[PDB]
Amino acid sequence: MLSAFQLENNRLTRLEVEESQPLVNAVWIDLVEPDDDERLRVQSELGQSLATRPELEDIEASARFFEDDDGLHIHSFFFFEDAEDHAGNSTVAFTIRDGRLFTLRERELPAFRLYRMRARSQSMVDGNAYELLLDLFETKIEQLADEIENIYSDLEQLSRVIMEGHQGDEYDEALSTLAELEDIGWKVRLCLMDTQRALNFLVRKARLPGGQLEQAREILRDIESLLPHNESLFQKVNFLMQAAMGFINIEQNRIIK
Amino acid sequence: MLSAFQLENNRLTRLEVEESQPLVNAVWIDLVEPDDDERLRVQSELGQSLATRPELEDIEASARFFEDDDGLHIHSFFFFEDAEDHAGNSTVAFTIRDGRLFTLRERELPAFRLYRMRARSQSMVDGNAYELLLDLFETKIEQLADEIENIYSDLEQLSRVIMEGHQGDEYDEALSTLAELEDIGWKVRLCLMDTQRALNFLVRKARLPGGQLEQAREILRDIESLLPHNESLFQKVNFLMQAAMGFINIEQNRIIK
Amino acid sequence: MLSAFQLENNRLTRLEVEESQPLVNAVWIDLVEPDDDERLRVQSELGQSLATRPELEDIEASARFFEDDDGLHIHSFFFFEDAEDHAGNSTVAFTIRDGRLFTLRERELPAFRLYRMRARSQSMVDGNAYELLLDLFETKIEQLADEIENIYSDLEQLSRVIMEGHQGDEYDEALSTLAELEDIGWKVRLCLMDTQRALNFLVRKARLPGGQLEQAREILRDIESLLPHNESLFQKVNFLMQAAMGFINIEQNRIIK
Amino acid sequence: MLSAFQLENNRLTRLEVEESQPLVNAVWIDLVEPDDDERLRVQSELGQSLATRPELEDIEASARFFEDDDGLHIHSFFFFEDAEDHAGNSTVAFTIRDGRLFTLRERELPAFRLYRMRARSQSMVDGNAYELLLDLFETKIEQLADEIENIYSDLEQLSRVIMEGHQGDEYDEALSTLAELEDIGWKVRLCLMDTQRALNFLVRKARLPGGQLEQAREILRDIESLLPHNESLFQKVNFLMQAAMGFINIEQNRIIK
Amino acid sequence: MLSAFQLENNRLTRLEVEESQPLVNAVWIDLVEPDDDERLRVQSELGQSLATRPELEDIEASARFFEDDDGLHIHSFFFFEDAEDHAGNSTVAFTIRDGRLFTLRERELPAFRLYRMRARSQSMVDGNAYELLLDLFETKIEQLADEIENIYSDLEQLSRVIMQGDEYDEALSTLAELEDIGWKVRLCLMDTQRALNFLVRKARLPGGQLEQAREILRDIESLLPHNESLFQKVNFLMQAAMGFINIEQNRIIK
Ligand SMILES: [Mg+2]
Ligand SMILES: [Mg+2]
């Protein structure tokens, strides 16, 4: 799946690619699960080699944040929910070269789907690959903050089930919920920590235009403010786990009598 | 619910608003669950758009602490107890523009009720929106310190109940109490951490008059001194939880014999 | 209970007060649970208002370490054991004004009782309110170190009971002891952390004579050296708790067979 | 087992040693479980004493990272899996002297086997003992990152077994798996922490050619980026352990009824 | 028990003290559980008052690392095993005054026995009280590292045991014994670290000694993390075992 976009008065406009062949006009090429036809197309029409599937699995800093003849690379985790409502992080490879952004990903993602909806009716400022990459990160952070906001309200409800329920039915269900919330928080944190590394890397490496620099700093400031929330949930979740076991042991004593 | 206040020799005096229409004389406009009539009134009489309900839910730094054409914004958690004695944090949107403070909130709050009682018979110093915002924060911290002081004495009593035990139904009751105290501490900490971000933001952003700057620093110094107390209570609470489970297991062994 | 002391060749000498009325000659006035007669006496004979009972309950920094027209104030936790051998921390309000020290406290305290015994036959160096305040702190630290030393030996003995006992009688008793030791350590730590704040405050605030400054630094160095011991005991205590539960579960399995 | 290598246009080429005796041409001598014949050979043909078996067991810094008349020594843990699929760390003694690298090890190791396979068809840059040592470390890190990547996917699967399963068969198996994953992470961390010390030592000690210095820094940057992942897995593992016990206690209550 | 040593070409040689009375020639006086005769002897023959029994119990920095008219004092924990193989830390009072080292201790200790064995047949470098004190510390650290090395291999074996029986009472006991050793090893390290930081700032240590002290500090910095790593493992194993016991209990009930 190849989509391509070009700039028209600081507005991202979707190029037609199946028909209008010239990719050279694009500022952003976005690949989703691309076949070897789409990869070869990008290879010949632009200069661009793209990361292979197994190289997006690598977690080492030097494998994720680096510069080479193929440009500036940032591999970042993006958060999503699979078909059965289970959280995950999918790695996305960002590459910037000759003022163009390339995004390569294994799947559809809510930050991208959201950015693209908005991009249809919203001007960029400086209008360049770096602003665009940071815009995708801004959107990612906005969505992680929503996730956290939801863990809070779910944990609030679940806290009351744990104080007020005693049946076994309500309690199997409670530990499962707790475990699902821990997992989301955990994945959210991986997502934040990685974005944070990525942004620190760019601040030191790219000659980011000054408008971009402030933007990146704003994003770093948001991450600094969400991480503590993450840690706060893990304390609550662990405490609730402990309390439940307490209630189960008390119940068991009742039963034995 | 719209209340408005004005200054008379550095004393906050309540304006009559249902009758005396001129709001322009007010230094502080305080809205509680305002209908669209009250919002429109503020909009036309002063320049002021106010945050919507869903924007007070956003927890990201950039959504809470920011400057724009509508002024300087600080969204801060305030602590309260709902009808059934369950702790919570309610977000309050502070806005300062043209030397006036606007507070927008979802509910009545004890810090506000307390500040207002005192404001009746107590002079301000410099007499301005920034002092006023910091006064509300001073008051908030004073109350969070009281909360913590109370968790201490409650935990002290509950500690003794747990050493006797010697179980039914003194022990169901003991874990419930523990769990209520953990939750208050937890919510107190969120409240402190957020006030701390807000105050760090203001120290860097507003041209705070020097009298205000010291005031802000004093409040930050207090938060620095309360956070450790918070962390201390979690250690105790977690240990007590562990001990109780110990006593329950010992009891269970007795029963089985 | 009002006692007063005066200096005679750098020696603190108890000046009889029921008879010899002139309090002006005293360097140190020490009140324990003073009635309104003793408070009024200090108020009229010296310039001195004294903190009320509820103000000694406040735990925020600005309520404990501050300067005002009534002088320099330090409120510090002191460690003690109540009638039923339960550890506690009692707040003592220190005030220095016009070269005189005022101590106000709710109860007898072992540091004070000890300092006073020694003061009968021991010269001070510079002979002033600040030295005197730091001497009381030195004594406090000496006693907290003794507490910790004792938690170690008690925990050593209890460690052996936990490996070698199996009866239920010996194990109720073991968890209780553990819980008692955790509580002492916990209260010791609060006592240290607070003294540490107090001393940091003085180092920056009072024009401490240079002999006093070194003294304060020595005390801070001691606290830096006791805090780690405190943290070490919590690890042990927690581990022992876990082991005991292990033994109880093993025992329970034996019983069921 | 003695292997030796020499440089030919920055390409490591395996010398024949059973036949072609001259070892003086080698840049790298690699010993695996060497007999006293192979040790004596290295001793006489080059100047080189080699660490004894018990000296590779010493874990203090001064025993692992040091310079002496026999050259520059680095003893580093390398990760492996024994015959029964149990993780372990084997110490390898690196020595550099007169532009030659000596590696002494107790066993075959996957980093070495991998480096050697690649070395057959891949040019070095500067072509020296220090580059070579850092290449082996680069390889080691690449493999530790693979390990961590695998703990993640295994923990992902195991997380779902723990939420969905009730049978005892699936749960014995689940704790065992958890315990195996904890042990790998644990050993991976020891391996990283030690490599980190080693590289910090070299950065301060060897006159590393500038191309090597950047290489070492790149490796340090990767370790800084993997350690947090390690800590993240322990939190998950510990939580899952707790949850499982919860489910077992719930099951036990069912059984008793 | 009074032993005394003197220097002969940078070699520590044991003086005869029951017979050859002159103590003034000694560089190192080592007392173990000394009676008031041996204390008075040191008091009169040299200038030296020695710490009392209860003052070696004090754990406050100011009670352990300090300078006064009786010289430079360092009280440090040393690791040992009592008669029933139970780990402990015994405080040793080091005092340096007029180029002489005094050690006062409650008991025999393996670092001291080891140092003395070696001191027979091994030259010192600069040959002074400060080198001698640091040599005793070097030896102490060498032994703590051995302890940790052993907790590792024991924990490795015990890990496998933990993956019906009488084997499980035994396993928790072993775990608890290993936790205790690690714990005591840490106390020993943390204290030595405080002592060495104190000396670096306080004594006019000759430059050869300064590097020596820094080497020792570097070793401690490298052992402490190992200590913390073992507690994580030990705590986890404890948790796992309880898991297995609960699973077993469920089997039984069925
Ligand atoms: Mg890889
Ligand atoms: Mg949102």
Ligand SMILES: [Mg+2]
């Ligand atoms: Mg636990």
Ligand SMILES: [Mg+2]
């Ligand atoms: Mg208060």
Ligand SMILES: [Mg+2]
């Ligand atoms: Mg050794």
Ligand SMILES: [Mg+2]
């Ligand atoms: Mg003492």
